[PDB]
Amino acid sequence: STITRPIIELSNTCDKIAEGNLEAEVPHQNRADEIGILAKSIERLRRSLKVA
């Protein structure tokens, strides 16, 4: 699936990043849809966390 599964994966990614894996790879960045924008923004959050 194109929406439900990617949402689940990104949620797992946010938590991985939140628990302190600033090196996690954020999936779906190459999407041209709402999943793509969401994943691009999750990537920018990750980079923002790389603050310390």
Added chain:
Amino acid sequence: ITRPIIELSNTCDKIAEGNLEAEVPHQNRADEIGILAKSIERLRRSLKVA
């Protein structure tokens, strides 16, 4: 669920730009958007904890 996805993307960017106080919508949902929102809320809290 296109709308909540867009809103959350906007929310993520607001936080990534430095507004670590931006309220994360959709957290009280039972579905996959609900977990996503909570995971983004926990990510918001982490930027602070850091």
